[PDB]
């Protein structure tokens, strides 16, 4: 069932204390479902939806965003494997 049905030129930048996703890398954004997938929490997630929810008529175009943090992923060495989390931040410990 692989084929199936299931159920502005002025580019704008945001930078600040995001609390989700790998930092030190620019991300190009188009929809806030993409934002929640990456920027789980913090002021950047509010800022993106504010930019696209800024005005009843007007909206920001594609947004360029970076999490500016020194975050690193949780990891473990056990058995014969080294295990690394794809998530970056304190939440990866869970």
């Amino acid at each position: 069932t692989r084929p199936h049905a299931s159920i502005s030129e002025k580019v704008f930048c945001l930078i600040g204390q995001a609390e989700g996703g790998e930092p030190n890398t620019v991300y190009e954004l188009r929809n806030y479902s993409q934002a929640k997938r990456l920027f789980r929490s913090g002021e950047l997630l509010d800022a993106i939806e504010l930019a696209w929810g800024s005005n009843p008529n007007y909206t920001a175009g594609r947004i360029l965003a970076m999490r500016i943090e020194d975050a690193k992923p949780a990891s473990a060495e056990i058995g014969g494997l080294k295990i690394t989390s794809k998530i970056y931040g304190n939440v990866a410990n869970n």
Partner: protein, 171 residues
């Protein structure tokens, strides 16, 4: 005999038209398979039939035309409709090349003339919508002696297969 029925349906379709999601008109199917099972079959290149009870009606539709060939990277091999269109187009191009050039009138039928004939043929086929598009500027011909080596590109008709809806209720 289900494969017989599928062959009777496919032979009735337009050239290049897919059996994908077409009705089968089978009465009842001894079906074990559900969605994940259908994924397992189709990813393996095994055609599967799904029973669908609509709100007020019932019909049996076939999910895809994937061929037994496993590797999906080349849809000419993996997909039957693309292969059928490729076979018919190639046979027509073969015949037209035969008539135009292997009449062997002269060696003076230089490479540029062959390039022009190719481009006119692809233009006609674009006009017929037998092909989606082709590069006008990226056809090359090299001729030496009695032999011409030709390379061309064609963009196949790009089919559209998947949709996902995220319905949200508010207020």
């Amino acid at each position: 005999m289900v494969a017989v029925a599928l062959g009777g349906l496919a032979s009735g379709l337009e050239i290049g038209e897919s059996i994908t999601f077409k009705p089968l008109r089978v009465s009842s199917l001894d079906q074990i398979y559900e969605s994940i099972d259908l994924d397992e079959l189709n990813e393996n290149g095994i055609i599967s039939i799904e029973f669908v009870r609509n709100r007020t009606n019932t019909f049996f539709r076939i999910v895809d035309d994937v061929t037994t060939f496993n590797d999906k990277s080349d849809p000419v091999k993996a997909e039957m409709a693309v292969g059928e269109a490729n076979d018919f187009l190639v046979s027509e191009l073969k015949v037209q090349l035969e008539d135009q050039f292997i009449g062997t009138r002269t060696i003076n039928t230089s490479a540029s003339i062959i390039k022009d004939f190719i481009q006119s043929y692809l233009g006609r086929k674009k006009r017929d919508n037998e092909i989606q598009d082709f590069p006008a500027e990226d056809v090359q011909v090299i001729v030496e002696g009695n032999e011409a080596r030709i390379s061309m590109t064609v963009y196949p008709i790009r089919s559209f297969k998947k949709i996902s809806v995220s319905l949200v209720y508010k207020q």
